[PDB]
Amino acid sequence: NXXQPXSX
């Protein structure tokens, strides 16, 4: 998860 690129 995260607003970051595909991850988690």
Side-chain angles (χ1 to χ4, degrees):
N1 200 335
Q4 57 184 270
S7 204

